Amino acid sequence: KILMDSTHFNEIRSIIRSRSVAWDALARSEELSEIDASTAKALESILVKKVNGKTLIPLIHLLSTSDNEDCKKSVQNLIAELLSSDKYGDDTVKFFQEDPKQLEQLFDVSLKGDFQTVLISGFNVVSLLVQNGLHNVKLVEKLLKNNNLINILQNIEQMDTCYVCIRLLQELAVIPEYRDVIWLHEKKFMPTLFKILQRATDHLGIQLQYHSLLLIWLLTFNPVFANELVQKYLSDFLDLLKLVKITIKEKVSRLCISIILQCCSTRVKQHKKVIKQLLLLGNALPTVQSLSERKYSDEELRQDISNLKEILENEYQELTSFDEYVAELDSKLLCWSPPHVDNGFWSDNIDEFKKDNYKIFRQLIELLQAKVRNGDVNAKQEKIIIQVALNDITHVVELLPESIDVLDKTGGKADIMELLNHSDSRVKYEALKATQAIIGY
């Protein structure tokens, strides 16, 4: 196979070889012809253990004729073994390149039959398509569109199948047309990649995560695909940074750093906007600063981390605390930021809050109302957000009290009164402080 050295590929090959059907037995059961049985036996002796060569077509015909699951698994295992073998496999790939019918038959066999047989056939097809002559974007797209490949990729319990699929996609990503096919497959099944990234942030799993990161980086190598994936998941950069911080593998960290840099690279559209959004939401600057302080054995990973830190510092140089506050308000997430407790920041941003007919004040009132509606859950994060919103409202009422009338009109006083009866002691204290700042002494 193309990546038969992987543990998942070896396990799939062993599973396929477990269900083995003899060529003579298939011929006896009218599942193959005598010449086809002889060709299958020769191929089995050559690979499973003489090369079939031109006889591989009779073996494929016998496999098609033998619809039994055991025979299909045996044929797939033999094909995978031939692909792994240096002498065999290459001849089959050359024959498929010369005759597109053989390549089409191999693609149809891929991701078909039994799960082990489907995996072995897909690995054989990937190995055949690894050659430049036999490479075909249409065959790769057809194999990816198969339900078996999607099930293997989404098989959380079957980590080996997901790792094999990710490795196959990463290997196919070298060819630009196959790279576009892999990008389309990623756009279709981004949920599997997101789940893998979340699992890595929170072995077979490590290899699968590394393969997924490599595939993501290969897709992001194209600026258009990187720009498309940037808006696909705003938290993807934060998840990648968390996984890189958690993971100690140098290769995984380097791949994550390269993927993060590609999204913020100048080649991708809206590079400055993407970098600013990442730094505002995922705290790219602090994570990069922490990574720079930490020592990394890999020189390439260290250089990538240094470049990412420099990019984050350059992006944050133009940004200010007002941009961070705006991003926090847009994300509706507040955890008692330094600007909330900074008297100078509130004094210098009081006019900004009241600007545009108190647009920021209206947004804060809407966030407080949403938190009050979400106050039934009374989650710790929700309680912290509610307390931060109450503190911001109290500050905006104490300074430039014109916003107090707007808040009262928009039900801010009613929201504060409702929060005054909240079960949480901190929320009740914050609401009482806001009420005291409103009309109290």
Binding site: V174, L214, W217, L218, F221, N222, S258, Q262, S265, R267
Partner: peptide, 23 residues
């Protein structure tokens, strides 16, 4: 390898822009 591949694509695009300038 991915970074080098992206550089080759960007380098080819720069040469492609030169062809438009040559045109």
């Amino acid at each position: 390898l991915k970074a080098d591949q992206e550089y080759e694509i960007e380098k080819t695009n720069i040469v492609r822009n030169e062809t438009n300038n040559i045109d």
